[PDB]
Amino acid sequence: SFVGLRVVAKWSSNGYFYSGKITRDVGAGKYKLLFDDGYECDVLGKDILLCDPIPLDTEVTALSEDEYFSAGVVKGHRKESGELYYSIEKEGQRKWYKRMAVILSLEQGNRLREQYGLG
């Protein structure tokens, strides 16, 4: 079953996809999501991406600590002490981000639905 899988799932109110875990199969293509920030809600399987981590060469949205964000391309993944880090390139410069600081816009996450969606 899909319960306990780490995923990147759409938050309907804003269209962005965020890291989370499926906690329940609600039936008929719906899943309960516990996002990594602690918010929970039901999400359609077609808005759930089964990528942990988000793939190399994906365009993502990177979060700065002062609440700015920008597009960037995933160029690396690194595991350290059980935690995931992304290396993101923007204008030829790479920078590391914790998992919590990488999300997908509606356009970015939609691109991945064919290969990674639970639709």
Q: For the chain, which residues make up each domain, given as ranges?
A: 1-54, 55-119
CATH architecture of the domain with residue range 1-54: Roll (2.30)
Q: What is the spatial order of strands in the sheet that 69-80 belongs to?
A: 93-98, 83-90, 69-80, 59-63, 102-103
Are the C-beta atoms of 86 and 99 separated by less than 8 Å?
yes
d(CA 49, CA 110): 9
- Residue in this structure with the two tokens 């799932």, named with its chain if needed: 9
| Contact of 54 with 60, CB cutoff 8 Å | yes
**104 touches 61 (CB < 8 A):** yes
Q: Take residue 2 and report the two structure tokens written for it.
A: 């899909």
- Tell me the C-alpha distance between 101 and 85, whole Å: 9
- Order the strands of the 6-10 sheet from edge to edge: 40-44, 30-35, 17-27, 6-10, 48-49
To one decimal, the resolution in angstroms is 1.6
d(CA 9, CA 18): 5
Q: Obtained via which technique?
A: X-ray
The pair of three-digit structure tokens given for residue 67, joined into one six-digit string = 């609440």
- What is the DSSP code (8-state) at residue 104? B
44, 35 contact by CB (below 8 A):
no
Question: Distance (Å, rounded) from C-alpha 108 to C-alpha 60?
Answer: 6
Q: CB burial class (10 A; 0-12, 13-18, 19+) of residue 22?
A: buried
Same fold across 1-54 and 55-119: yes
> Rounded CA gap, 71 and 11, in Å?
18
Q: Residue 87: how many CB atoms within 10 A of its CB? A: 16
CATH 2.30.30.30 for domain 55-119: yes
**CB contact set of 29 (below 8 Å; sequence gap of 6+):** 44, 45, 46, 119
